[PDB]
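Table S5 (text form). Sequence records supplied for joint modeling of the two-component complex.
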Amino acid sequence: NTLPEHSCDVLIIGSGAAGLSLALRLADQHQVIVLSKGPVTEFDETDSIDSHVEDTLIAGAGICDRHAVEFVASNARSCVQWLIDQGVLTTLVSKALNHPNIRVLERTNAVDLIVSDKIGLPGTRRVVGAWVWNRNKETVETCHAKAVVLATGGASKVYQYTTNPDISSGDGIAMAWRAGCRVANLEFNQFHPTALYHPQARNFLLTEALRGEGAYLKRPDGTRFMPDFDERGELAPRDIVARAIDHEMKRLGADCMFLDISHKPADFIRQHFPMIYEKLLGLGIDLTQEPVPIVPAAHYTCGGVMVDDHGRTDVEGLYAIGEVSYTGLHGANRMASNSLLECLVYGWSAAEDITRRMHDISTLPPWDESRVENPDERVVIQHNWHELRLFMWDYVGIVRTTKRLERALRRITMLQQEIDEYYAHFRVSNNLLELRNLVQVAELIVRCAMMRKESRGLHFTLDYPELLTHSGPSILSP
Amino acid sequence: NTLPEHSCDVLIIGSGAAGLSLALRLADQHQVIVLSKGPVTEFDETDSIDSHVEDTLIAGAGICDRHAVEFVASNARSCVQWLIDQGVLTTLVSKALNHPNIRVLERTNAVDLIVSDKIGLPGTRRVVGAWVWNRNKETVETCHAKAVVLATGGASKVYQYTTNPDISSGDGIAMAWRAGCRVANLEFNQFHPTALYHPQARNFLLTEALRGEGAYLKRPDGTRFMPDFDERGELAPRDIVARAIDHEMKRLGADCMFLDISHKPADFIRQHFPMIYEKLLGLGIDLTQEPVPIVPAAHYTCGGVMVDDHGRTDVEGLYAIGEVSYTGLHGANRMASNSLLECLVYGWSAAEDITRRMHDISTLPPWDESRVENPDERVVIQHNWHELRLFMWDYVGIVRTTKRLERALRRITMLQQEIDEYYAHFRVSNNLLELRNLVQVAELIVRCAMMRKESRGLHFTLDYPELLTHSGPSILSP
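The corresponding structure-token record, covering 956 residues in total, follows.
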């Protein structure tokens, strides 16, 4: 038991809108530490609320928790105005760096949460800090806190193609499960249908508006495949466009599909889509004369760690806000603008709850730091990382079936057994933490999907094309 | 029990130098059928023999069977002259199509050998024909024969990168094992160090002579990696060049490495390597100003089905000649010109043995032809095919270790269990036959490698860098 290298009132793991809007709400009265994965820098009228709640329930396809929808819709206008009041008419980075009461630890990867009854401390089971890999010093340090907030994003990196990898590794979901938290709805993962497929894409995305402006969707032969799937063709609903692409990609053994607005005027392109035009030009693609290669990419996790109205998890002192959590706002899909309101509304209520509960104590046990060095086994850790991402794409991907899911499970179990057998106490590295957490989250994602015997929202399975009469969320318990 | 769709004296499965030189030696007195996978068209002085035998024993690294080396070296001049006498001063295709006694069945994939004690026939266990998928008629037909010769090539397609895929699917090795034959030395697989890495490479190969003429071997940053592996740099022995590339590719997570003769004169290139120059130009690569992307590719199987001096296997009526067999000529590596002499010398002796043993009979049981149709499961068969090829590349590839081999075994076992559980009596298709045979051969390849506790020739394992004092071939028995 040693003195912890860092200590604060509130430890916030993650730095998007949720974790920085929380950090800024607490900073005038408390000492906040923000954990950043890389460099930290790189509703007016009543009828309207009512509509918002209704459109959310609709795009939730029947399993939203309406008290969580209503909680967010009725706290939305003030959480937005709070944005306007901060001068952030986008980011919160300069505001939090400007605050003397917020400290940002950059290049940090949380390893595991420190939970009292585990450090042979007594009292209610509760979280009292986290062990944190500092990639600058290359060591695991202790960080003691009175409340720890998970604000890390989703788990889309379990999938081969992902739109926002830096906020998608799943570390918060996995840490919260290892600490005893329930998770839910992890089979409801949104895929964007048309991301650039290219070696320097840098996750660029091709907008729906290319389609709203006439672009066609082509097979590698050059023919249009959408009329085989849906009468709206290229303007079918996004989930339907993703499913047709997934289908074709798998049916033909093709690497990608194509998006082409060539057939139509040029300056017509030039005026409407410069920012895309230029970007694609700079990769040697002319939006004016050729098809653009594209694949679907996992984009948003509608499920996650379970939380109540204050962003509290099942484990005292631990909160979880934004994409990393399951509030019951989304149900089986995601309506535009709700991910940002969930971030702002639960950062507000977790702030108020943390503030009214703030009892100090302690010093803590350091990390083990087994320092085992096997350069060749280290290269397998990376092989394992790609393998997980490819098989999830095939076996818990856009289109599912029961025999594909059993294939994912069997592979996730094999990796878990290899991890235990061959990596016990290897020295921490980012690749190793990411694998361990991607495999933990993939197990939760397939167990949720194998549980739901119906197609609803983002869960589409060929063995159960219909809705069940009685449904609800998928809930797992550690 | 039905009349067989085809019937002949000698069934030859495969159509390279071995199977056509055999077919032509037997055709004036017997009725031969040649099974072709696609279109069939697409030593003078004594001191010299003695040297050949010695250089073979040397490149065999200590485990050649010297009676099999000597058998080939002493029958080489006449098997070559036999080539000159056929007017084939390259291919044997027009000569066999010109012979009235040879029939060629094109687009055919042998499924399994028909072995007497299995068709509840009585007498010594012996082969009496094969069930054959005809891709034109889309049906499995029976072919009755008095002797069946396997002449199908090696198993390099178990690996992600392969130089000659049409002669590498492993179907002969797998069929011969299912019929009861022993196999040996399947851990001794030769990899060519510099194949073109490109989407339309069509397996083009970059010659050693580019290196003998000054080309450098580069990392993606552009630096030369060979001085870190060996003092001969780019002229180190081929196996050493392949191992350094494998190493770097895995160490950096890179897709390929590079071959560049740019640094030097142009017409200098133009005169020495036109045929390469032009070919690479036509793919948009100038051998004159840029690096050429390259990966190692599995090229030759030194092991295979066990055979004696006449090309007889352990199962009466069945022969196996050329790359598909293990004669004990090669030992742990392959010396240039011996693969072609093995083909010619054993096609000669199997011909003489078949001719002196030629008793007729029968009619046979048709294939089952379960006609199960599940289009989505069919798409998994292909996923499974890529997965096998990628993991063999990592786990029984150019550089080995004991923990990588245990990872291959565990994956091959999982695929075998999936195949049984999910594909029982699916209808035959080429993809399904290839998977079944690649997985069977991969199991034999890893069991041989896990057996040898030393690095010898083409088997290089980081856990056992030295030679054992007592060694011999790796032998498995069904």
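Note: The radius of gyration of chain B is 23 Å.
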